[PDB]
Every structure is written in structure tokens, then in C-alpha cells.
Amino acid sequence: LGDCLRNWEDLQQDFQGIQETHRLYRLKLEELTKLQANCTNSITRQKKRLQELALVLKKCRPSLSMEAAQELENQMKERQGLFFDMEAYLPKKNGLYLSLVLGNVNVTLLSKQAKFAYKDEYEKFKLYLTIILIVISFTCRFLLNSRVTDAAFNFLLVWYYCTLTIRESILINNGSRIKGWWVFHHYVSTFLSGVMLTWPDGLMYQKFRNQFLSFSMYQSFVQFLQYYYQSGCLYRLRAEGFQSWMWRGLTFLLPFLFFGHFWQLFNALTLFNLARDPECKEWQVLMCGFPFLLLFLGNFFTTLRVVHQKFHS
Amino acid sequence: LGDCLRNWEDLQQDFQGIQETHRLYRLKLEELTKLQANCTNSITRQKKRLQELALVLKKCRPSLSMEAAQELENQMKERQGLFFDMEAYLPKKNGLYLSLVLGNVNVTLLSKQAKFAYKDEYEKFKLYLTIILIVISFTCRFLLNSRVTDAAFNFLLVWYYCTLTIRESILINNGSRIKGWWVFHHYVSTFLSGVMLTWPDGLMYQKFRNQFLSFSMYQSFVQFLQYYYQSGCLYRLRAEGFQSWMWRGLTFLLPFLFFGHFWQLFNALTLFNLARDPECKEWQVLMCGFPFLLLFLGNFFTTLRVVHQKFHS
């Protein structure tokens, strides 16, 4: 007891200060929420008015002695630009997909330190899980051929893509701007790995395994390159010649990304050629073919856009 | 231009104040993070010391003129109780599953208003998606029998359970205390819906469809009752006789929850009885049987514990 009584009295002294510090923290927690409320309401209100006057300018654009109108348009371009900056700091309401999963919790990371550190943890997840795909997909093609192991690799893909969607819809809400297609692509590929999962073994499977498992290897290996491309881009973006690195970086990368897009079409063509063969008699082939064709029409098109912008700017 | 010039000068006046308000908000944002840092470090430090002295008391418990030791133990029970209160307010590091999915973003909802409003949105998600399960599972059993529609219902289950895991690992981190088993149960049932997905049609399937689809209906209908039980509990918890409602509420509910547990074992027994039949010759049956047996051993056991605590307290 002698020690048991002694520790309490001094521990009580230190506990007292900790109790009072938390009392102040509760105050500045609530006062900051009110500051979050007013500031959020103020910007969204003024953004509405200027958009109306921007609409007014839009209707008054033919009203063109018009040099101010172009400059006020630049001024409107400036004002909308600044409001897009501040709102990145304030909490933003979740989108649609983040209301189904993860619920209505504010996932907005305030400081730029966090907005940076999260982007790298997103990359370090794409790489770390990619090599696990290569190892398993390499085994399924060369070492062991069975429906159970191909189901284990396919279930990993359905999880890898569905997880990457949540880790991207946060980045859109966090303040970054990923192209509209990439979020949609992560769905079609999931639905693609869905139909393949319920394929029944037969003659149709052993004619569409090598062309799918090998393609899963090459696309996975390309992901290694995009890492060394984007990781190099982000660190420099944190800090002219960088634009040369950006152009030269995409230059070495574009052939491989186009090679994959043409392979994607070639796997699509096989299925339609395999389906029209009478011996197939499986519903799953033709509904598996369209995602492959759909992915090619999107990827080859969207990749051309980001390059056209790169040459333009 | 006359209107185009006029709006800017007054809009500039209002924009000025909004610019300065955001300037102060940036200050109290950072000062609160430092307050979050110090307060979080202070409690976790003192929690360690008292745990050591609690360990010291643990080793000095046989040292028993011991009435203070019991009271200091109560004092230790009080101190640990208070620290569990404050830390619920401060941000807490993500667990393990929330590091794989959703990344390292603070999902801690500070005010008690949010900690309450999230719990109801979790229930309102369990109900809203349950009736969609009943409608589809009712169709798959009576209206239409096909491998494609049963795959559509099964994929919905794999998503419904995997989504409920994220919406629960947040509640554990948010401050609630869900039993350890319930988070694990949402995995085994997912793995159960996994093996059934790769079942190949044959003689074994049409002998294990009615006993699974109907069981999926009854378990889904029970979920309607748990809603009217928990929703009634939470609203009263927000505010003696309530304990009578709690005891009477579980009393009417316990028979149905036990009826389901015995059905779970009965479906498990069929598979082992079906597997030992030579005509099956499918790997998926016996690996599908153990989850059904595993779920019964857990559910019937854990449900008995929460009732034993209810009678005890």
C-alpha cells in the first residue's frame, strides 16, 4: 500500500492539468465547426451568384469595346479559380459512391501535408498489390492449371479493383482531379472478372485461358512502369526541364500502353470468333466479349486525349 | 458592360471579407492540430504509466488492511474509465482493415451528435438493403430458377457483407464496442457465398438450392425484427422501465434467433450427408459445409453469452 498510495497523489497532480487541457480543446473544437459552417456557406453562396452573373455574362457574351468583357471573363476565371482553392481546405460532402460505402463521414484531409502523403500511399498500394498479381498470374499460366486456383486469382482481381475505387473516390473528394473515365474503367473490369468467375469448365475455357492469363501478366507488368512514371512526377511536382521529363516520361511509356490496348482488342476478337463457333453453346462468352471491346474503345480513346492535351500544352 | 462592371465592385467588397475570414480559419485549424497532438500524447503517456502501476498493483495484489487496495483498484477502474472517455473525442489511428481499404484518413467523428447520427445511418442501411435481399431471394426460390439469377443474388450478398465490414470497423474506431465475433462472422459468410459462386451445375446443386435459398429468406426476414429491436433501443438510450423493455425486447426475439441457429446446423448436416453420397464428386460441397457448421458453433455460443450477461446484469 505504501507505494500504492504514493503514486496516486503525484499522478493525480499530473492528471489534473490533462483534465483542464481537454476542457479547452473541446471549446476550440466546436468554435472551429461554426467557423467551418459559416465559411462553407459563404463561398457556396457567392459561387452561386457569380455563376449566375457568369451565366449573365454568358447571355451577355453576344452583347459585344469588348476588351473588358474578355478581361472580366478572365476575372471570372480568376474568381472561380480562387474558390476552387479554398473549398479544397473546407470539408466537402461525400459523393454518391462514398455514401453507399463508408457512410457519411468527412474524409477531407485538411493540410497539404496529408493531401500529399495520401497520394503516395495510394501508389504504394497499387505497386505492392501488383507484384502479388504477377506472382499468382505467373503461377496460373505456367506452374498449375486448375479451376480452383484461377478462381483464387480472379477473386483477388475483383477485390483489387473494387478497393481501388474507394481509394480513388476519396481522392476526387479530397481535391484531386482524376479523369472521368478511369473511375468508370475500374467497374467494367470488375464486371469482366465477374462473368469469368461463373464460367463452367469445358471446351470453351481451355481456348480462352492462355489469352487471358498472359494478358493479365502483361497489363500487370505495365503497372510497374506507370509507378516509376508517376512517382517521379509527384516528387518533382512537390518542388521547364520538369516538363521535358514529363514529355520524355510519357514518350517512353506510350508504346507499351498502346501495345496493351491492341492486345485488349485482340482478346475481344477471339471471343466473338470463338462464340460464333457452334460448339461453344455458353451464354458467358458473348457477355464476356463486350467488356473487352468496351475497354479497348475507351482506353485507346482516352489515352489519345491526354496526349493531345500534352502536345497542345 | 454597364451591368458587367457594376456587379464586380460590390461583389469585390463582399469577397474581401470572405478572404479574411478564411485567413483566420487557417490559423485555428493548425492550432487545433497542435492541441490534438499534445492532448493525444499526454493521455497515451499517462495511460501507459497507470497500466504499469496497475501491473504493479497486479503483482502487488497478493501483497494483501487491504481495503484501500480494493478502493485504489476502483480508483484505477475510474481513471482508466475516464481516459476511455476523452480518447473517444480525439482522433484515433485506423485499425488494420481500415489501413488496407480507405487508407490512412481520420474517420473519427468528433461530436456526440455525429456519433449518434452515424449509428442510425448504419441501421437504415441494414434495413434498406435487407428488403432488396428478400425480394430477390423470394424470386430465386419461387418465380425463376437459373444459374444466372442465383449468381446475381449471390454477388449481392458478397457485396452486402463486405460493405457491412467497413461500416463496422469504423464504428469500432469511432468509439462503440461491437462484440469481437460479429466482425469475424461477416467474413465467414462472405467466404461461404464465395464457394457457392463457383459451384458447377449438376446433381449436387438441385439438392442444395431449396435448403439454401429459403434459409436466406428466413435470415433476411429476421433482420427486420432486429431493426425494430435495436432502433427502439437506441432512441431510448439517447434519453428502470427501459431495462424492462430491453429484457422483454430480447425475450420475444430470442426464439427466432435460436430457430435460425438450428436451421444453420441443419443445412450443415445436409451437406455432409450429401457429400458422403458417392454421386456428388464435387470438391465444393465439403468446403461449403464447414462455414455452415462454423457459423452455428459461433452464433449459438455467442448469443448465449450476451443473454447470460443480460440475466447477470
Author numbering:
A (entry chain A), B (entry chain B): 9 to 72, 76 to 250, 262 to 335
What text appears in the publication on this structure?
Alongside the functional characterization, we analyzed the structure of TACAN determined at 3.5 Å resolution using single-particle cryo-EM. The two protomers of the TACAN dimer bury an extensive surface area of 3049 Å2, mediated through the TM domain as well as two long N-terminal helices that form a coiled coil. Non-continuous density was observed inside the tunnel, suggesting the presence of a small, non-protein molecule. The TM domain in TACAN is indeed similar to ELOVL7. TACAN conserves two of the four histidine residues. In the purified TACANWT sample, the apo form is dominant and incubation with S-ethyl-CoA shifts it to one and two analogue bound forms. In addition, no enzymatic activity was observed for TACAN using a free-CoA detection assay (for details), which demonstrated robust activity for ELOVL7, thus TACAN does not appear to catalyze the same reaction as ELOVL7. In conclusion, we do not find evidence that TACAN is a mechanosensitive ion channel.
